[PDB]
Amino acid sequence: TAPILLLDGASMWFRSYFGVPSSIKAPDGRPVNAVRGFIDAISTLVTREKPRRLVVCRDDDWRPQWRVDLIPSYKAHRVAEPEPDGVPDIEEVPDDLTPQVNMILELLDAFGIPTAGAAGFEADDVLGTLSAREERDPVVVVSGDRDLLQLVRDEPAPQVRVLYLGRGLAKATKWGPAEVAEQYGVPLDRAGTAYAELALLRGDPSNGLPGVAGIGEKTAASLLAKHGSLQNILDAAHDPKSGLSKAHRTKLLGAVDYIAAAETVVRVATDAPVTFSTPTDTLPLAAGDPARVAELAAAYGVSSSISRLQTALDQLP
Ligand SMILES: [Mn+2]
Ligand SMILES: [Mn+2]
Ligand SMILES: [Mn+2]
Numbered sequence: 001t002a003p004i005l006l007l008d009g010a011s012m013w014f015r016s017y018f019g020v021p022s023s024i025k026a027p028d029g030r031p032v033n034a035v036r037g038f039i040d041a042i043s044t045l046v047t048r049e050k051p052r053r054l055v056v057c058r059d060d061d062w063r064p065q066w067r068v069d070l071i072p073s074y075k076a077h078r079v080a081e082p083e084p085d086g087v088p089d090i091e092e093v094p095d096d097l098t099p100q101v102n103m104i105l106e107l108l109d110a111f112g113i114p115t116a117g118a119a120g121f122e123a124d125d126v127l128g129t130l131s132a133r134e135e136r137d138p139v140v141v142v143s144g145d146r147d148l149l150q151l152v153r154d155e156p157a158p159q160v161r162v163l164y165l166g167r168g169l170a171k172a173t174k175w176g177p178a179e180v181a182e183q184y185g186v187p188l189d190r191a192g193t194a195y196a197e198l199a200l201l202r203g204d205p206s207n208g209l210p211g212v213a214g215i216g217e218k219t220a221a222s223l224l225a226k227h228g229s230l231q232n233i234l235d236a237a238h239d240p241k242s243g244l245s246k247a248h249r250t251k252l253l254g255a256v257d258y259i260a261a262a263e264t265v266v267r268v269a270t271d272a273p274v275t276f277s278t279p280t281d282t283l284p285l286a287a288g289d290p291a292r293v294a295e296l297a298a299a300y301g302v303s304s305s306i307s308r309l310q311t312a313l314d315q316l317p
Contacts, residue, residue: 001137003161004053004281005045006127008143009115010062013038013104015144015165017097026301034100039107039305041169046283046312049140054283055276056108057126058117061088066120070261073208103300110296111306112288114281118272124148128268131160140174147207149184150196150268152176160192185221187228197230200259200266209262214251223248234259285313 016037024033046054063075065085081090108115116126124147131139131151138158141148144165153160154177161174173179177191186194201220203211215223227233227244236242237252244252252259287293287310297306 002051002053003049003138003140004055004134004136005049005051006130006139006141007042007045007054007056008123008127008141008145008148009038009056009104010059010101010123011143011145011165012041013101014097015168016041017094017100019168022096024301026299028299030099031096032100032103032301034097035103035107035300036302036305038104039302039309042113043305043309043312044169045142046309047315050316051140051283052316053137053281054114055130055281056113056115057123057130058105058115059123060117061120062091062122063089064120064122067265071209071258071265073210074265076208078208103296107293107296107300107302107306109277110287110289110292112278112284114276114278114283116274116276116281118274121269121272125269125272126274127151128270129272129274132270134158134160142172147199147204147266147268149175149180150192150199152180152192152195184217186224190229194224194229196267198224200230200262204266209266210258212251212255212259215248219248230259230263283313283316285316286310 013034017034020033020037022031022033024031024036026032063079067074078092079089080092083089105115116130117123118126118129124145127141127143127148128151131141136158139160140163141151141160142163142165146166148162151160152162152175159176161176163172164175165172177188180186180191180195181188184195184198186198198217198220201212201215202217203209223233224230227236234252236244237249293306294303297303
């Protein structure tokens with residue numbers, strides 16, 4: 001059967017912002033390069049993957065307070081203005097990109113393309129929750145964010161793949177457990193979860209996470225190779241006769257608190273309370289509100305992109 005596409009919205013429209021020139025502008029002069037690129041990526045995906053189901057996943061909270069409480073440096077270098085509890089922090093985002101996010105969300109809503117979010121969670125968590133719950137169709141998670149490699153799955157069916165956007169969409173290929181195992185040296189039988197344990201240990205500068213000092217990617221992969229899992233590695237450290245080196249024991253034991261905190265920060269949630277903007281995740285084959293879509297697309301200078309999307313939809317069997 002055809003896959004369900006789960007789109008990491010912010011990953012994709014940030015990529016469109018930096019991959020489409022800012023001289024692409026609306027009639028009022030505001031850049032719409034991210035709008036154009038994001039709509040064009042949806043049309044490309046519809047044509048390449050021919051889904052019947054498609055969801056754009058939102059960041060209802062891009063920097064959840066529960067993660068910051070565990071690790072205060074989490075995404076700290078990306079905050080423009082921190083906001084008190086209950087209110088998402090203001091992310092440092094180019095001034096001419098935020099209005100384009102509003103334009104995109106307005107078009108998706110008027111078209112009826114499903115969007116999903118969960119209060120207090122990231123799009124990463126929405127993607128992890130929807131891919132964990134999927135029982136009917138193969139899942140394609142579309143993102144430039146290597147965090148989501150932890151979601152790859154062969155069994156139980158259906159499979160989960162990440163269409164990874166690190167080199168852009170034209171060059172993107174589907175990552176499964178084999179690809180993550182081959183490119184990162186984690187065990188194949190639990191490749192996705194072990195990738196998250198690898199990232200926890202080595203650190204993640206784009207998320208503001210330091211990792212465990214002294215355990216680089218090479219060491220963490222080999223430790224996972226020999227012991228199979230992070231839990232087994234901590235067991236080897238806590239047990240004073242295991243074959244774990246004393247230097248490794250010192251680095252791991254000196255980080256027990258960070259490791260316990262980081263575990264829930266690094267893993268994406270799989271049971272977030274996701275809500276949809278639409279009744280189902282079915283991809284509409286025509287605009288839910290065509291007059292509003294035409295008025296918005298003209299106002300946002302992307303009428304030809306919307307027309308291209310409708311042609312791709314028209315070609316779906
Ligand atoms: Mn805050
Ligand atoms: Mn994200
Ligand atoms: Mn992420």
